[model samples]
Target: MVDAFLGTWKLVDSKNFDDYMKSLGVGFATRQVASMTKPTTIIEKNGDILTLKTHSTFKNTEISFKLGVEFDETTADDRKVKSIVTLDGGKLVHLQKWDGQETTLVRELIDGKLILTLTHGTAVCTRTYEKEA
Candidate 1:
């Protein structure tokens, strides 16, 4: 389970991240930066807790949650969300409920890389991160 994700990953590409940010109600300035920033994702699991991180030159987002537990998450775009993460098959599904929206973030390991797909309403973005060797 946890063994499936055990290292740092480098962001190689992103599709429709700007549209995804806009769907999340992120401000203009932040979306501008999000459009150009290449981030790194780090995942670590110990005991029953998991830490997921996405960091770049302009912003950093981190979450630490015990498996099967619910926690509050404040996204980099300043959205407050109540979320939980569950493992589904070979992928991890991050489900969030917010004041005005709900979103699903699915992370799967594909060909040794981490592919994250974000969905909000009709907007979707997929980000691929190469596993660091």
Candidate 2:
């Protein structure tokens, strides 16, 4: 399940990401930096265990969990939530629930590109990534 997404990807484009961050209650100063920083996502898989690392100059966030297991996730925006990851169809789905909020993030691999769909409240951000060489 993790095989399809096991690679290093660089962020190429982000659409409405600032609005998404704003929905997450991120500070204005942080959003200014986050909106401009293009983070590299490094996904490593070992059997059923997986590690997803979002590396950026502003802040780095790494999530380590197994498929089908629910774990605590501290998002890059500093939101603490219960996260569950699963393979649905051909997409990797991450469901996060925290406090009174919920967000669903979907990751799909198309050819050599990675398309990330982030949904928070009523805000939706589509981020595209290109596989590293």
Candidate 3:
């Protein structure tokens, strides 16, 4: 399942991201910076362990974990959360929990593009990433 995601990806499109961050309780100024910043994502796998890395002018984050394993994560926004990455059908599902709040990030490979859908409560944001040539 991680095979389709093993590469560098560049952000190409985003929709409703500010609303999504607001729903996650991100501050106004932080959301503004995050909305303006375009980040790149890289995925790699070694045996059963997988690494997901994000890069941007604002900040960079990397996590290495096995599927279905839960780990502590400090998000790019500086939120500490319990995170888990799993394969759900054909999608890579990431769940984050903190302070009784939960958020979901689902990544799907569609037409050679990586589609990321983030949801917090009723707010949903979609971002598109194309593989770096």
Best by lDDT: 3
Over 4 Å off in model 3, which ranges?
A: none
Q: lDDT score of model 2?
A: 0.92
Runs off by more than 4 Å, candidate 1: none
Distance from true location, Cα of 30 in model 1, Å: 1.4
What C-alpha lDDT do the candidate models reach, one value each? 0.88, 0.92, 0.93
* Per-residue lDDT of model 1, residues 4-111, tens digit only: 777898989999998888888888998888788888888998889899988899989999998779999998777789999988887899999987679999999888
Write down the TM-score of every candidate: 0.94, 0.96, 0.96
Clashes of each: 0, 0, 0
- List, residue by residue over 1-133, the lDDT tens digit for candidate 2: 5687888999999999999988888999999998889999999988889999999888998999998999999888778899999999889999999887899999998886999999988999999999897
Query: Of models 1 and 3, which has the larger lDDT?
Result: 3
Candidate 2 vs candidate 3: the lDDT winner is 3
Which is the winner by TM-score between candidate 1 and candidate 2?
A: 2
Clashing pairs in 3: none
| Residue pairs with clashing backbones, model 1 | none
Candidate 2 wrong stretches, greater than 4 Å: none
